[PDB]
Amino acid sequence: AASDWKPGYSMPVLYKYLNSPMERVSLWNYGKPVTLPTGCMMNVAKYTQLCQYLNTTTLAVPVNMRVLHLGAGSEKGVAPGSAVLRQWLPAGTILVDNDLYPFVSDSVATYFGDCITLPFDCQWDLIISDMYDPITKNIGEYNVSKDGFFTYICHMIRDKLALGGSVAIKITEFSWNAELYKLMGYFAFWTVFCTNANASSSEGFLIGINYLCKPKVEIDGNVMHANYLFWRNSTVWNGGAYSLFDMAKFPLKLAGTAVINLRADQINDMVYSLLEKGKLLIRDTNKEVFVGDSL
Amino acid sequence: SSILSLCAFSVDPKKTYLDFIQQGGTPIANCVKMLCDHAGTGMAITVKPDATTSQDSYGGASVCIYCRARVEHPDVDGLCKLRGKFVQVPVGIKDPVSYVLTHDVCRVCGFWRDGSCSCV
Ligand SMILES: Nc1ncnc2c1ncn2[C@@H]1O[C@H](C[C@@H](N)CC[C@H](N)C(=O)O)[C@@H](O)[C@H]1O
Ligand SMILES: [Zn+2]
Ligand SMILES: [Zn+2]
């Protein structure tokens, strides 16, 4: 099938407008009929396909970009997603990652512990989360909004994300947060992207591109997640990893992006159109210097 | 892992691992192999993946015995030369950690000193 050759699928806009009832997901494809290029870890394929999608957005990509990656550790003690991000991001990008448990990473800095205690107080240009807690989910008969590390993610969007910055947050059918969905209404563009490699999973990446700090649309988070599940329920994908054989354009190009420490009183009409194009990040401009960055 | 823990207990993690390989040990696993276009120049340790069709490219930290064993590197004042970069090895290889520990990077052309470097 031709659709197996794209990096994945993003939520059609019409689904974003529905009022779907909450229901269990049921995928037609649990037999996982996809092969991975020889020797290739699943999360390498997964993160690579995510970055392939992000290559098509108006991501703000300056010099000395600040990238925070939460939930970057694995049970084997390495960081496959952080390796992909390091490959993807322009040289000199400040990549900092985090996990509850010790692991070994190609980021310039790693912090072990609850993301809540992350000791860096700077504003970020891009936040990626793969945080996920299996079957410690809210018990009950109802799939309800979760408040774990999501509380921290929402706080980082509200206070620690530059205007013009973006996020990509892993969610699943049970691992989701209603406020996070509402905050996607504060970006120039938002969707949920599902990688072709992991098409057999309810996993999606909830993505906001170009933060505006003002509600551009009003989203009921509880309804929106149900809409996302309704979309997974009414589509059938083989899955696939063929896009992984097209790597010539993988690296994220510097976008023509400026960083300006603008005041809240200088955010006029032009600024906003610049933010929506990935041309402007609003935050303090100083190069954040980490001990482990080869400078 | 048992070998990584033996390495971290020992004064010379490199010797301990290489001796262990020579004695029938099974190689360190879960090295992070990247996807790339294999149109690279083929240098050993690079800012981004740089493999030719003759090479695999790995996340540097995952192929560093010192990183993997959680012990200090040989130069306590410096930074790991592998962490945060990408390591190219022959495409077959099953023991990338061994390969990294037993080859040297020419310091002017950047290729491995295993028949790829042409200097002097
Ligand atoms: N509050 C939390 N703070 C930091 N990390 C968390 C938290 N909750 C869950 N995690 C981590 O989320 C991770 C989920 C993993 N499946 C991530 C896989 C990893 N991203 C990879 O590249 O393979 C676990 O390593 C958790 O330790
Ligand atoms: Zn190291
Ligand atoms: Zn040379």
XYZ file of C-alpha atoms and ligand atoms in Angstrom:
444
model
C 0.000 0.000 0.000
C 1.270 3.464 -0.966
C 0.388 5.000 2.403
C 2.932 2.663 4.045
C 5.695 4.815 2.503
C 5.043 8.052 4.349
C 6.560 8.640 7.794
C 3.072 8.292 9.265
C -0.395 9.821 9.549
C -1.637 13.085 11.043
C -5.170 13.657 12.350
C -7.462 14.912 9.554
C -8.804 18.351 10.436
C -12.458 17.296 10.263
C -11.978 14.865 13.154
C -10.728 17.794 15.223
C -14.208 19.337 14.874
C -16.267 16.364 16.025
C -17.907 15.623 19.388
C -17.017 11.958 19.562
C -18.059 9.776 22.512
C -15.227 8.165 24.446
C -14.698 4.505 23.444
C -12.031 1.816 23.617
C -9.623 1.755 20.726
C -9.735 -1.350 18.561
C -7.122 -1.575 15.823
C -7.579 -4.070 12.988
C -3.838 -4.771 12.775
C -2.537 -6.175 16.071
C -0.434 -8.779 14.231
C 2.203 -6.039 13.625
C 3.036 -6.833 9.951
C 6.006 -4.465 9.578
C 9.734 -5.124 9.238
C 12.458 -2.720 10.366
C 15.627 -2.064 8.327
C 18.351 -4.482 9.391
C 19.498 -4.098 12.988
C 17.173 -1.152 13.644
C 15.701 -0.495 17.095
C 11.981 0.290 17.142
C 12.413 3.696 18.786
C 15.099 4.693 16.268
C 12.551 4.063 13.509
C 9.810 5.755 15.561
C 11.748 8.922 16.392
C 13.146 9.096 12.857
C 9.632 9.024 11.388
C 8.513 11.693 13.882
C 11.370 13.980 12.797
C 10.498 13.288 9.152
C 7.023 14.664 9.856
C 8.427 17.620 11.785
C 10.590 18.416 8.747
C 7.336 19.405 6.969
C 6.166 21.924 9.607
C 7.073 25.559 10.257
C 9.362 24.580 13.122
C 11.394 27.522 14.387
C 15.029 26.442 14.012
C 17.632 29.021 15.092
C 21.292 28.853 15.982
C 21.780 27.674 19.574
C 18.379 26.018 19.602
C 17.213 24.754 23.002
C 15.692 21.270 22.946
C 14.375 19.374 25.981
C 13.632 15.639 25.705
C 11.659 14.063 28.561
C 11.399 10.321 29.057
C 14.568 9.658 27.042
C 15.826 6.592 28.906
C 15.270 2.931 28.133
C 15.302 -0.226 30.227
C 18.549 -1.103 28.449
C 20.116 2.134 29.685
C 20.657 3.889 26.344
C 18.714 6.726 24.687
C 17.740 5.793 21.118
C 15.407 8.759 20.667
C 18.045 11.184 21.929
C 20.518 9.777 19.397
C 17.990 10.440 16.616
C 17.343 13.975 17.893
C 21.108 14.595 18.030
C 21.418 13.349 14.437
C 18.399 15.451 13.388
C 19.053 18.799 15.072
C 21.531 21.309 13.585
C 25.064 21.149 14.946
C 25.391 23.316 18.040
C 21.809 22.617 19.112
C 21.587 22.355 22.905
C 19.885 18.991 23.514
C 19.071 18.183 27.162
C 17.230 15.047 28.238
C 15.730 13.408 31.291
C 14.436 10.136 32.669
C 13.489 8.691 36.034
C 16.289 6.147 35.915
C 19.982 6.311 34.987
C 20.889 5.981 31.325
C 23.596 6.928 28.843
C 22.854 9.579 26.228
C 24.278 11.667 23.394
C 22.627 14.792 24.789
C 24.929 17.501 26.111
C 23.318 17.145 29.550
C 21.242 14.428 31.229
C 19.294 14.773 34.477
C 18.120 11.664 36.340
C 14.880 11.979 38.271
C 11.261 13.077 38.182
C 10.946 15.625 35.380
C 9.304 17.804 38.049
C 12.720 18.371 39.649
C 14.533 19.292 36.431
C 17.043 21.902 37.695
C 17.170 24.082 34.564
C 15.044 27.221 34.574
C 15.559 28.453 31.017
C 12.932 28.822 28.308
C 12.926 26.156 25.600
C 12.401 26.188 21.828
C 11.230 22.578 21.459
C 10.044 20.024 24.005
C 9.766 16.334 23.131
C 8.240 13.871 25.582
C 8.112 10.098 25.380
C 7.176 9.805 29.066
C 4.797 6.906 29.629
C 3.773 4.830 32.688
C 2.317 1.397 31.875
C -0.945 0.149 33.557
C -0.477 2.388 36.631
C -3.318 4.203 34.866
C -6.376 5.760 36.508
C -8.464 2.736 37.523
C -12.241 2.788 37.103
C -14.684 2.126 34.321
C -13.861 5.394 32.543
C -10.933 6.612 30.426
C -10.346 9.921 32.209
C -7.750 12.670 31.976
C -4.420 11.798 33.616
C -2.330 14.141 35.790
C 1.117 12.715 36.097
C 4.098 14.189 34.325
C 1.400 15.830 32.161
C 0.922 18.447 34.876
C 4.607 19.287 34.459
C 4.353 19.314 30.649
C 1.450 21.778 30.773
C 3.435 23.999 33.160
C 6.437 23.974 30.819
C 4.239 24.997 27.890
C 2.644 27.820 29.889
C 5.849 29.210 31.469
C 9.010 27.720 29.915
C 8.406 27.584 26.144
C 9.501 30.467 23.943
C 6.870 32.150 21.840
C 7.223 30.419 18.498
C 8.446 27.167 20.059
C 6.874 23.757 19.505
C 6.172 20.528 21.388
C 5.706 16.860 20.480
C 4.229 14.861 23.380
C 3.682 11.087 23.334
C 0.127 10.066 24.247
C -1.716 6.751 24.134
C -5.356 5.760 24.531
C -5.072 5.796 28.335
C -2.026 8.136 28.725
C -3.375 11.611 27.948
C -4.326 14.919 29.563
C -7.254 17.219 28.732
C -5.470 20.493 29.548
C -2.601 19.524 27.242
C -5.138 19.163 24.445
C -6.589 22.579 25.304
C -3.115 24.126 25.165
C -2.738 22.901 21.576
C -5.268 25.634 20.811
C -2.521 28.158 21.663
C -0.291 27.123 18.745
C -0.366 28.263 15.134
C -1.008 24.614 14.224
C -1.610 21.380 16.126
C -2.213 17.735 15.246
C -1.608 14.170 16.392
C 1.000 12.268 14.375
C 1.174 8.466 14.371
C 4.332 6.875 13.004
C 3.936 4.229 10.336
C 6.404 1.971 12.137
C 4.234 1.748 15.270
C 0.859 1.767 13.502
C -0.259 -1.204 15.640
C -0.347 1.018 18.762
C -2.665 3.720 20.076
C 0.493 5.809 20.554
C 0.365 9.214 18.937
C 2.483 12.329 19.154
C 0.397 15.334 20.182
C 2.137 18.179 18.378
C 1.882 21.941 18.706
C 3.855 24.094 16.239
C 4.687 27.764 16.882
C 3.420 28.676 20.353
C 1.414 31.931 20.453
C 0.544 32.144 24.189
C -3.070 33.035 23.275
C -5.973 30.676 22.533
C -6.263 30.698 18.749
C -8.970 27.992 19.013
C -10.914 26.679 22.007
C -10.483 22.945 22.581
C -12.336 20.752 25.051
C -9.513 18.371 25.903
C -11.790 15.516 26.947
C -13.706 15.688 23.652
C -10.508 16.079 21.609
C -8.925 12.869 22.889
C -12.137 10.981 22.171
C -11.964 12.481 18.680
C -8.413 11.164 18.301
C -9.494 7.661 19.360
C -12.476 7.849 17.012
C -10.003 8.603 14.207
C -7.827 5.603 15.104
C -10.994 3.481 15.291
C -12.231 4.404 11.789
C -8.963 3.991 9.853
C -6.931 0.886 9.023
C -3.180 1.068 8.369
C -0.764 -1.717 7.524
C 2.117 0.135 9.089
C 5.522 0.328 7.484
C 9.080 1.654 7.588
C 9.766 2.380 3.904
C 10.214 6.114 4.566
C 13.368 5.095 6.500
C 15.096 4.345 3.164
C 14.752 8.026 2.161
C 17.265 9.714 4.468
C 18.927 12.192 2.103
C 16.833 15.097 3.417
C 16.529 13.955 7.044
C 18.629 16.626 8.813
C 16.675 19.585 10.138
C 17.828 22.711 8.324
C 18.348 26.036 10.019
C 15.070 27.695 9.179
C 15.942 31.363 8.949
C 14.852 31.971 12.531
C 15.632 34.935 14.765
C 15.637 35.008 18.568
C 14.558 38.300 20.155
C 13.952 39.075 23.835
C 10.798 41.016 22.994
C 8.576 42.469 25.692
C 4.958 41.435 26.095
C 4.090 44.984 25.010
C 5.863 44.599 21.616
C 3.880 41.552 20.358
C 2.055 43.203 17.469
C 0.463 41.958 14.229
C 3.751 41.514 12.357
C 5.323 39.580 15.239
C 2.445 37.106 15.202
C 2.700 36.452 11.468
C 6.441 35.898 12.007
C 5.722 33.461 14.849
C 3.296 31.458 12.671
C 6.000 31.020 9.991
C 8.734 29.664 12.245
C 10.713 32.872 11.694
C 10.832 34.107 15.295
C 11.385 32.795 18.805
C 10.685 35.094 21.742
C 12.873 34.389 24.778
C 16.132 35.543 26.290
C 18.881 35.266 23.687
C 21.920 34.165 25.680
C 23.685 30.934 24.786
C 22.966 28.480 27.583
C 26.332 26.920 28.485
C 26.327 23.357 29.814
C 29.398 21.720 31.322
C 29.135 18.737 28.971
C 28.762 20.637 25.689
C 31.815 20.551 23.428
C 31.781 24.268 22.777
C 24.614 -6.630 32.602
C 27.401 -8.703 34.136
C 30.302 -7.602 31.928
C 29.505 -3.891 32.278
C 29.462 -4.357 36.049
C 32.809 -6.200 35.962
C 34.192 -3.386 33.802
C 32.970 -0.741 36.253
C 34.584 -2.604 39.159
C 37.958 -2.735 37.415
C 40.787 -0.242 37.065
C 40.968 -0.800 33.287
C 37.466 -1.253 31.826
C 38.939 -1.549 28.329
C 41.286 -4.410 29.208
C 38.552 -6.150 31.203
C 36.145 -6.028 28.250
C 38.680 -6.999 25.573
C 39.980 -9.894 27.701
C 36.349 -10.936 28.193
C 35.684 -10.911 24.432
C 38.821 -12.978 23.777
C 37.595 -15.491 26.387
C 34.276 -16.150 24.623
C 32.146 -13.393 26.118
C 29.244 -12.141 24.182
C 29.558 -8.567 22.867
C 27.915 -5.543 24.450
C 24.415 -5.228 23.007
C 21.907 -2.426 22.488
C 24.346 -0.158 20.673
C 22.192 2.496 18.989
C 22.457 2.057 15.213
C 21.234 5.034 13.191
C 19.413 5.259 9.889
C 21.306 7.325 7.319
C 21.641 7.839 3.572
C 25.040 6.062 3.452
C 26.363 8.866 1.223
C 28.982 9.948 3.768
C 32.723 10.390 3.485
C 33.505 7.576 5.936
C 35.387 9.309 8.747
C 35.517 7.574 12.121
C 33.851 9.958 14.603
C 31.719 12.743 13.170
C 29.248 15.458 14.169
C 26.467 13.699 12.213
C 26.227 10.229 10.667
C 28.846 9.900 7.928
C 28.717 6.250 6.826
C 29.473 5.023 3.342
C 27.615 2.020 1.970
C 30.474 0.101 3.621
C 29.634 1.252 7.169
C 27.097 1.342 9.951
C 26.723 4.517 12.016
C 26.154 4.413 15.787
C 25.258 6.846 18.545
C 28.627 7.485 20.153
C 27.654 7.159 23.809
C 26.126 3.716 23.217
C 29.436 2.311 21.873
C 31.667 3.780 24.605
C 32.690 1.233 27.234
C 33.207 4.033 29.774
C 29.795 5.588 29.112
C 28.060 2.196 29.139
C 29.814 1.001 32.311
C 29.194 4.293 34.152
C 32.834 4.892 35.049
C 35.011 7.937 34.556
C 36.807 8.275 31.250
C 40.613 7.979 31.006
C 41.039 11.808 30.885
C 39.107 13.060 33.894
C 39.521 16.681 32.839
C 38.207 16.180 29.292
C 34.942 15.080 27.710
C 34.177 11.745 26.096
C 35.171 11.829 22.436
C 32.303 9.514 21.443
C 29.348 10.876 23.430
C 27.264 13.276 21.351
C 28.844 12.189 18.049
C 28.419 9.293 15.646
C 30.758 6.348 15.097
C 31.190 4.613 11.748
C 32.207 0.938 11.687
C 32.263 -1.793 9.004
C 28.683 -2.653 8.063
C 28.823 -6.271 9.215
C 30.271 -5.708 12.628
C 28.616 -7.350 15.660
C 30.956 -5.987 18.388
C 31.110 -2.227 17.777
C 32.449 -1.607 21.290
C 35.435 -3.861 20.571
C 36.046 -2.168 17.221
C 36.119 1.272 18.838
C 38.499 0.086 21.584
C 41.069 -1.467 19.203
C 41.357 1.177 16.460
C 42.706 4.716 16.435
C 41.466 7.818 14.651
C 44.066 9.569 12.539
C 44.188 13.092 13.929
C 44.524 14.948 10.587
C 42.193 13.186 8.132
C 39.632 11.818 10.611
C 39.392 8.280 9.226
C 40.195 5.164 11.230
C 43.804 3.981 11.116
C 42.731 0.637 9.640
C 43.492 1.126 5.943
C 41.123 4.082 5.435
C 43.587 6.753 6.549
C 46.100 7.636 3.821
C 48.308 10.208 5.580
C 52.109 10.308 5.871
N 7.812 11.744 35.829
C 8.675 11.119 34.906
N 9.751 11.865 34.809
C 10.762 11.494 33.976
N 10.662 10.367 33.247
C 9.554 9.606 33.353
C 8.569 9.958 34.158
N 7.582 9.023 34.071
C 7.975 8.111 33.205
N 9.204 8.469 32.752
C 10.051 7.774 31.811
O 9.333 7.532 30.403
C 10.047 6.587 29.850
C 9.201 5.738 28.847
C 10.152 4.982 27.920
N 9.359 4.020 27.196
C 10.849 5.919 26.926
C 11.658 5.106 25.818
C 12.750 6.058 25.325
N 12.156 7.330 24.947
C 13.504 5.487 24.126
O 13.999 6.225 23.302
O 13.619 4.273 24.020
C 10.605 5.739 31.037
O 11.961 5.624 30.834
C 10.271 6.557 32.285
O 11.425 6.450 33.275
Zn 32.091 7.844 26.910
Zn 45.049 10.237 8.269
